Each structure stands twice: as C-alpha cells, then as structure tokens.
Amino acid sequence: ETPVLEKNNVTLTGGGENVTKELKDKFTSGDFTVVIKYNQSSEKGLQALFGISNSKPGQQNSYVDVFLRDNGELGMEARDTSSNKNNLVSRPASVWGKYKQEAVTNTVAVVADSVKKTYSLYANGTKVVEKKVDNFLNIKDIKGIDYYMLGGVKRAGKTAFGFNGTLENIKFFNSALDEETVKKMTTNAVTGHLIYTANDTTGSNYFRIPVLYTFSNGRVFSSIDARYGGTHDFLNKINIATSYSDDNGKTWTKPKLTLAFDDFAPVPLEWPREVGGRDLQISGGATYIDSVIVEKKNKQVLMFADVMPAGVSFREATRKDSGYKQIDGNYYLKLRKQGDTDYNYTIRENGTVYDDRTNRPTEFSVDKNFGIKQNGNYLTVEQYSVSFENNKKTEYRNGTKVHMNIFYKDALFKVVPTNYIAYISSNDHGESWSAPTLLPPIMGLNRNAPYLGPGRGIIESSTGRILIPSYTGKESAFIYSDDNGASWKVKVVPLPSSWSAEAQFVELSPGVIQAYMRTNNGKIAYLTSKDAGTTWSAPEYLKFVSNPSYGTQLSIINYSQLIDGKKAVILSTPNSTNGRKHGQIWIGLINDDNTIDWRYHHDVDYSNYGYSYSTLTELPNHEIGLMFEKFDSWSRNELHMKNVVPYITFKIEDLKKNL
Numbered sequence: 001e002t003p004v005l006e007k008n009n010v011t012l013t014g015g016g017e018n019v020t021k022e023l024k025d026k027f028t029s030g031d032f033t034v035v036i037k038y039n040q041s042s043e044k045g046l047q048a049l050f051g052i053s054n055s056k057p058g059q060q061n062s063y064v065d066v067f068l069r070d071n072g073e074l075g076m077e078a079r080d081t082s083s084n085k086n087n088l089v090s091r092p093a094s095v096w097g098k099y100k101q102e103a104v105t106n107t108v109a110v111v112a113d114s115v116k117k118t119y120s121l122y123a124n125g126t127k128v129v130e131k132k133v134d135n136f137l138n139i140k141d142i143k144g145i146d147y148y149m150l151g152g153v154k155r156a157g158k159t160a161f162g163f164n165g166t167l168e169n170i171k172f173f174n175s176a177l178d179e180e181t182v183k184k185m186t187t188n189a190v191t192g193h194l195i196y197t198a199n200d201t202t203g204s205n206y207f208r209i210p211v212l213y214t215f216s217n218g219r220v221f222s223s224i225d226a227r228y229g230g231t232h233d234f235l236n237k238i239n240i241a242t243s244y245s246d247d248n249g250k251t252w253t254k255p256k257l258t259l260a261f262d263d264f265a266p267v268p269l270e271w272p273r274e275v276g277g278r279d280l281q282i283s284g285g286a287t288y289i290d291s292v293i294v295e296k297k298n299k300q301v302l303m304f305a306d307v308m309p310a311g312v313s314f315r316e317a318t319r320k321d322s323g324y325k326q327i328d329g330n331y332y333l334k335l336r337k338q339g340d341t342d343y344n345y346t347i348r349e350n351g352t353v354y355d356d357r358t359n360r361p362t363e364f365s366v367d368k369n370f371g372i373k374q375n376g377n378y379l380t381v382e383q384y385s386v387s388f389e390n391n392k393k394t395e396y397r398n399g400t401k402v403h404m405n406i407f408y409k410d411a412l413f414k415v416v417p418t419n420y421i422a423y424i425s426s427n428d429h430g431e432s433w434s435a436p437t438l439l440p441p442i443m444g445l446n447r448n449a450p451y452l453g454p455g456r457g458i459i460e461s462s463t464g465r466i467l468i469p470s471y472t473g474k475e476s477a478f479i480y481s482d483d484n485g486a487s488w489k490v491k492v493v494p495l496p497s498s499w500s501a502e503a504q505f506v507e508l509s510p511g512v513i514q515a516y517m518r519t520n521n522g523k524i525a526y527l528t529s530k531d532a533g534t535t536w537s538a539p540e541y542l543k544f545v546s547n548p549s550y551g552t553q554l555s556i557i558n559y560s561q562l563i564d565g566k567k568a569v570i571l572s573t574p575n576s577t578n579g580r581k582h583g584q585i586w587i588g589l590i591n592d593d594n595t596i597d598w599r600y601h602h603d604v605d606y607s608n609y610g611y612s613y614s615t616l617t618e619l620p621n622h623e624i625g626l627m628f629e630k631f632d633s634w635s636r637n638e639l640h641m642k643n644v645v646p647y648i649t650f651k652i653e654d655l656k657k658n659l
C-alpha cells in the first residue's frame with residue numbers, strides 16, 4: 001500500500017506549504033490515513049500538521065486537520081460548514097516536545113474509516129484514541145474542498161494554526177490503513193522509552209506509580225502498578241509488575257507480574273474516557289498497590305506494597321481494626337467465616353486456622369500466599385472477567401477455577417475489610433521472590449495499617465536502620481527495623497493537617513536524615529531527624545515549588561558523586577499551581593551545616609506538558625534514570641490513557657542548568 005503523496009524535510013515557520021496540486025481529488029473513497037514524522041521548533045499555540053479545507057470565505061468550518069497543543073495533546077478535526085457537523089477527536093499527553101534542550105521527533109497519524117465511522121489517532125507506536133462518531137465526515141463529505149496544505153489550515157484565504165518545525169516525512173494515503181500497520185509506521189526512538197506498554201506481558205492496558213532502584217550488583221530494577229480497569233486507584237484490579245535492566249537501562253526484560261491476585265483476570269480492558277463513562281469502575285479485585293523497594297546490607301532485596309481485599313478502597317477501609325488478634329502474646333491474622341457476624345478464627349502456626357471460641361485447630365489452613373485449604377485440599381472459587389458490550393460493562397464468572405483466598409469476596413473465611421502492608425524478599429536481585437509476609441499491626445490492634453509512600457526505602461549509614469515511608473492521612477508513619485528486617489516498629493509523627501504524606505528519605509550526614517513529603521497546602525514539606533529517625537522536627541517547606549492543594553508524590557535520592565565539590569541530592573517533582581505539569585529535576589548541594597543549596601534545575605519537557613508521579617535512581621555509570629507519569633494523573637480529563645509512563649536518562653551535565 002503506497003502513499004498518494006510523500007514529502008521529506010519540509011521546514012516551516014508558521015507559513016505552511018501549498019500541496020493542492022499534488023493532492024487535488026486524489027482521495028477517491030474519501031477515507032484517509034496521514035502519517036507525520038515531525039519535530040516542533042516552537043510549541044506555542046494550536047498547530048496543524050496539515051490541513052485539507054474549503055479555503056473560500058464563508059467556508060472556514062469546512063476542513064480536516066491534525067493538531068498539536070503546547071501540553072502535548074494530539075487531536076484532529078473534521079468539519080463541514082453547511083451541515084454544521086463538527087467532529088473533534090483527541091487525547092491529552094500523546095506527544096513529546098523537547099528532551100535535553102532538543103526537539104523530540106514524534107511520528108503521529110490519523111485514520112478516517114467510513115465503514116467503521118471512526119477516527120483514530122496514533123503517536124509513537126501507540127493508538128492513543130479511536131472514536132466512533134454519529135455525524136461522520138470524510139474528505140468527500142466535506143463540501144468544496146479546494147486547498148491541501150502542510151503546516152496549517154487555509155480558512156477564508158488565510159493560513160490558520162501555523163506549524164513551527166520540520167515535517168521530516170509525511171505520507172498521505174487514500175484509504176484507512178489497519179492498526180498494526182500504523183503502529184509500526186509510527187514506531188520510533190520514543191517508543192523505546194516505554195518499559196511497560198498496553199497489553200504487554202502484564203496483560204494491562206494501563207499503568208501508574210513507577211519505582212526505580214539500582215542494586216549493588218549493577219542491575220537497574222523497576223516496579224509499577226498495572227491498573228486493569230483504567231487508572232483509578234479504586235475500585236479497580238491492580239498488580240505490581242516488574243522489569244529490570246542489566247545493561248545500564250538500555251534494554252529491559254519483558255514485564256512480569258510479581259504481586260498479583262487472581263480473583264480477577266489480568267486482561268486488557270478498553271476503559272471509557274468520555275465525561276461520565278470515565279468514572280466507571282470494576283466492582284473491585286483483591287489488589288496490591290504503591291510499591292516500595294530497598295536493598296538490605298546483606299544484599300537481599302525487599303519489596304513492599306499496600307494490600308487491599310476485593311471491594312475495599314482507602315475510603316471504606318475500616319480505620320478501627322488492624323485485622324489482627326493478640327493471643328498469648330502473639331499477633332494472629334483474624335478471620336470471619338461466611339454467616340458469622342464476629343471474627344471467630346485466627347491463622348496460627350503453620351497456617352492452621354483455629355476456632356478462637358474453642359481454642360482448637362479446625363480442618364482449615366491458609367498457605368503462605370493466602371490460599372485456603374480444607375483437610376489439605378485447596379478450596380476454589382471461580383475467577384471474574386470484565387467486558388464491554390457495548391455501552392456497557394459486565395463482570396462475570398469466566399470458567400477459570402483459582403485457589404480460594406482470604407482476600408477474595410467469594411472466600412469462606414475473610415480478613416477484616418481494611419488495608420494491610422505486605423513484603424516479599426529476593427536473594428537473587430529480583431529474578432525470584434518469596435511468598436508475601438503481612439506486616440504485624442505496628443499501629444496497634446485497633447488501627448489499620450498505614451499507606452506506603454511509593455518509591456524507595458533507605459538504610460541509614462551510622463546505625464544500619466531500615467526506613468520505609470508511609471502515612472495515615474493525619475500522621476507520617478516511618479516504619480523501621482533495627483535487626484536487619486527480622487522485626488518492624490514505627491515512628492508516628494502527627495502532621496499539621498490531613499496530608500496525603502507520601503514521603504521519601506535522604507541522609508545528609510551520618511545520623512541525620514530528612515523526609516521530603518507531599519502536603520495539602522501546595523508546598524513540599526521536609527522534616528529532619530538528627531537521631532537516625534528516632535525523633536523528628538516540625539515541618540519546613542521548600543520555597544521554590546508551588547503546587548495545587550491536592551499535591552503530588554515526589555522522588556528524592558542521594559547521589560554518590562560530588563557536584564561542585566559537595567554531596568548532592570536529586571529531586572524530581574511537578575511544579576505548577578495549574579495541574580500536575582512542569583516536571584523539574586532539582587539538584588541540591590549539601591552545605592557544611594546540613595542546609596541545602598538548591599542550585600540547579602532542569603525542566604523535563606515544556607512546562608505545560610504533564611508530569612505526575614516520578615522515581616529517580618542513580619545508574620551504575622553515575623547517570624540518572626527517571627521513570628515518570630507523563631500526564632496529569634489527578635485530572636479527570638487524563639484518566640485511562642495508554643503508554644504514558646516513560647523511562648529517560650540524564651547525565652549530570654544535562655541537569656546542571658538554570659544557575
């Protein structure tokens with residue numbers, strides 16, 4: 001299948017290029033595919049990559065274009081003046097602007113299919129949107145089309161939406177090309193920055209909450225939430241997926257599901273993005289969410305995640321019960337049998353389920369992955385799948401029989417419907433993992449677990465203490481071990497307001513650590529301890545970041561090399577009061593007195609481009625790896641988008657900007 005027109009290397013500065021002679025009447029069916037490899041020399045304003053129009057005055061709403069905005073949104077219009085049919089299809093955060101001071105080359109495409117009555121948009125290997133419209137228009141449906149141009153739309157004799165940049169290659173086809181074809185054609189160097197992709201080996205269309213960590217053997221490791229029913233935190237099905245690199249982040253393993261329940265199938269789901277439909281949720285599968293990684297001094301790796309029973313969000317999680325009982329000085333996870341009102345059972349030694357009323361073993365036991373057995377045989381339940389037919393969400397039993405599990409809605413014995421924290425360990429730097437262990441009720445029997453601050457933990461150098469950041473919604477909760485992870489305690493620090501206090505740690509000098517965290521006041525807070533985390537100061541606030549009240553998670557790490565002769569920390573965060581945008585990487589230099597000179601910053605892409613959760617690591621060659629949400633993960637307008645969590649790399653030289 002060959003283009004009706006191909007052009008190369010067309011450099012424009014808002015003025016466009018007439019190609020009317022080389023396109024006139026060549027769209028026989030009226031359908032089209034246009035594939036554009038381009039880079040922008042300026043991001044400002046609404047810019048059309050091409051425009052097919054009726055250019056006569058009074059016909060200025062008769063055109064087809066593909067456009068870009070300054071926030072990375074890719075869109076198309078198909079309009080006809082006389083019928084007053086005005087189609088607009090787009091998806092936020094579809095393209096990249098700049099990377100390390102240079103214009104990024106993207107490849108985008110539009111497909112208009114008359115048989116399906118859909119418009120499709122592709123960017124850098126991804127089909128970002130396909131939308132069926134009632135009032136469909138192809139080129140033949142638009143009346144008096146007489147003008148075909150590159151880099152703008154001709155409206156009433158004037159060039160509108162002038163493009164600034166270079167069209168490196170543009171191809172016009174006069175039919176609708178298939179999805180696989182256009183995905184290949186738009187595949188480029190940007191595509192390689194996506195470690196997790198829609199319907200890869202995780203089976204998930206959506207991801208959020210990336211984490212990076214570099215292990216002592218040189219391996220660069222990531223984890224992430226695989227979110228199946230859109231990007232909702234709740235209700236949903238979420239797994240923790242992982243992937244790693246042994247060549248300094250150049251190539252990554254195919255993602256694996258590492259923490260995953262199977263009450264619901266890990267399937268690719270087409271979650272609706274329309275107003276209203278986008279609030280749709282699955283009824284809730286048992287879920288792991290918000291992972292935290294740390295390497296122990298003995299080189300063992302721990303990964304933590306929040307664990308939620310099926311149907312339980314942060315909103316309905318009981319605040320007044322840990323899910324544990326104390327019996328003869330032991331903390332046992334407690335269970336309610338279907339039909340009982342009280343929790344009459346505990347999981348004790350070897351997983352044996354005891355009736356606490358008679359204090360004897362029952363026929364039941366629970367394995368180390370929470371699966372239920374009776375007299376040594378597994379009980380099962382039927383797994384759910386979710387589908388769309390074609391309003392129209394349905395959930396159904398799908399034929400698969402899975403082990404019955406205490407975290408499932410269909411279990412005979414159920415845990416308290418609240419949140420827990422689990423961890424798994426690896427002695428082979430992430431190739432294989434243990435069974436999960438739930439943290440003991442560190443907050444007390446009559447309180448639920450805290451929520452993890454996604455990112456890393458640290459090991460404080462002077463004492464060897466392991467520190468894992470978490471929060472309750474009213475307090476910081478710094479989870480810690482003084483015995484190489486054999487036991488766990490917690491320091492609870494009341495906060496001045498109800499912060500979603502996702503935090504990360506840095507060590508400024510031996511014994512001295514800071515917890516940088518999200519607030520509900522627009523600022524990044526940091527609290528300081530000078531006794532290795534045993535006591536904490538009142539909060540102070542960074543002066544140069546100003547965000548919305550909801551806040552965003554941040555990443556901060558210690559860096560191993562001197563910068564300007566000083567020890568350095570590296571911070572990544574959005575910085576904008578208008579949304580989760582204007583991603584910045586800041587370099588802070590530690591002064592002799594343990595204050596920090598925030599001397600450099602690098603804007604990650606243009607300032608109106610999306611930037612939400614982030615994670616930094618120091619690569620073994622001392623470059624910096626960053627994985628981040630390249631969209632606004634708070635905005636209702638940016639929910640449920642595919643392939644928006646890229647990995648990129650910086651030399652320190654790239655970051656030492658702006659002073």
Ligand SMILES: CCC(CC)O[C@@H]1C=C(C(=O)O)C[C@H](N)[C@H]1NC(C)=O
Pocket residue numbers: 209233289290306314451473500551552633634
């Ligand atoms: C709205 C705050 C609330 C914490 C209580 O949600 C957090 C916010 C998030 C967010 O603002 O994007 C994502 C976190 N994964 C989520 N944590 C949990 C446990 O659901």
